[PDB]
Amino acid sequence: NCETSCVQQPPCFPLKIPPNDPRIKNQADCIPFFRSCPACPGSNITIRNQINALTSFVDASMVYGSEEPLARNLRNMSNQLGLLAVNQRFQDNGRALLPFDNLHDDPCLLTNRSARIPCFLAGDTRSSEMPELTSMHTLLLREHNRLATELKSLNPRWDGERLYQEARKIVGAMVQIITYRDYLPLVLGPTAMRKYLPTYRSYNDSVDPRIANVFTNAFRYGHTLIQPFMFRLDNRYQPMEPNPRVPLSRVFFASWRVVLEGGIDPILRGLMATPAKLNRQNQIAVDEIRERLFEQVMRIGLDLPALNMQRSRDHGLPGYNAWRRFCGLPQPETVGQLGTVLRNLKLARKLMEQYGTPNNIDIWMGGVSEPLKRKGRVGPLLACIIGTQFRKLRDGDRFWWENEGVFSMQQRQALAQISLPRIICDNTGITTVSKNNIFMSNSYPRDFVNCSTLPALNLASWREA
């Protein structure tokens, strides 16, 4: 009963409350925490490890699922058109929404009680966590159906299985491209990108493609990017009434907002035309995730930064200096050395006051503390861990989109034209979108263009006899 008990007994590892906490005045309370499931339960021989429930590959498993029963449940099985299932009670101005899931304890229903809109069903179980996330899931579902539709038109004799597989493969490729061409360079910056992701050669069957335990924590660097509001904008990119800026503690699991408050278009506009929060060493993460995470759907507001640090401990991860060493980076021993490495003596003092030694700094806390590489949004530690991970996911993926034999040359030439702005244009009521690179463009109207200037994906080289 880790959800309501503060007793520390397996499998609960509750976060205790320090004296003079700014928010939780009751020191006998706690922040709930369930330890990650062990790969070998009950063993006193094995070193405890945790489990990845998903495919490590960048294969759009968050659309299609990572388990056969779920993958079939996500499909429309009433015809041979190769489509993903869509909501049967609600549409978004005539366009598809994700189907609804049937959970035994559904958190989405608790966000707006009268509305009674349950969580959505997707390839991954977290698709409802924030409506912005939902919108991207919804976007990709639509793009699947659009591709299948066009392929059926182009190849009338293809059966549903063929259509589904061919569209799935295209969606997988588009996720890879957006990820490696557009996203990761702006994470790592140019130096790290060249270092950790040199030009692709060919599939290497001796590159291990598993997710590393540490990556599950280090990739949470993203929490530093989070804005405290969800922003919604109309077709003139103006604030969309009645609630254009919703505190994030009122959008977690709030599926009703997608269904009943204007669909995905206002949310996607808001994503394009609002800045990310910058990570700064004195401004690491916002109150809405530090103080109020999921407060509408459970007994207490969680602290996502604190959870990250508890989880690194739960997973038995080494501390900052061990990871610095692993990455071939110098390991500071003193406060002055840590000051030099962080280019910030004041933060180094705070960290040493907490941890006593940089050897003990938790990996997320240490990672996000580092100064950012030029034109990236992580420092050298996180750049090493994240860059190494994604290099293995690419070089160790037999179905990487550029691997010989996965696509024809003509198909690869067509895929090179895809972009996330175009995908938005094709699947929503939006007609004005971010100019490439979508991840950098953030100010309307300066950074925006009409959809009609963007070339569509040409599927002509998918035509069979």
């Binding site: 957006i178 401004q283 692993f326 037999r398 950098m440």
Partner: protein, 105 residues
């Protein structure tokens, strides 16, 4: 594993023909370093009151959050060169890569 295929399996099985679970779902994470537990093999640092890590008291996660992470949220710095879509794609991508199960109540 079949010696010829054309599409990914759903589970990721058979991507690597010599070691066909690698990258497949519901398998242990790979470790890039040996694990560090209070008892060597299972208990997290912070579990037992009074037990230090490498010579020092373990800091309450929440205290580290209070003293290092917290800031006055309305002083937040907008990133001039990133959209919130940059944040969002990251989470979406994360959800392609890893989900770590935990026991149900």
């Amino acid at each position: 594993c079949p010696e010829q295929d054309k599409y990914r399996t759903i589970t990721g099985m058979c991507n690597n023909r010599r070691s066909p679970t690698l990258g497949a779902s519901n398998r242990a994470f790979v470790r890039w370093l040996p694990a560090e537990y209070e008892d060597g093999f299972s208990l997290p640092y912070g579990w037992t009151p009074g037990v230090k890590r490498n010579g020092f008291p373990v800091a309450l996660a929440r205290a580290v959050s209070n003293e290092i992470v917290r800031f006055p949220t309305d002083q937040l710095t907008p990133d001039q060169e990133r959209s919130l879509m940059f944040m969002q794609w990251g989470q979406l991508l994360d959800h392609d890569l890893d989900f770590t199960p935990e026991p149900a109540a």
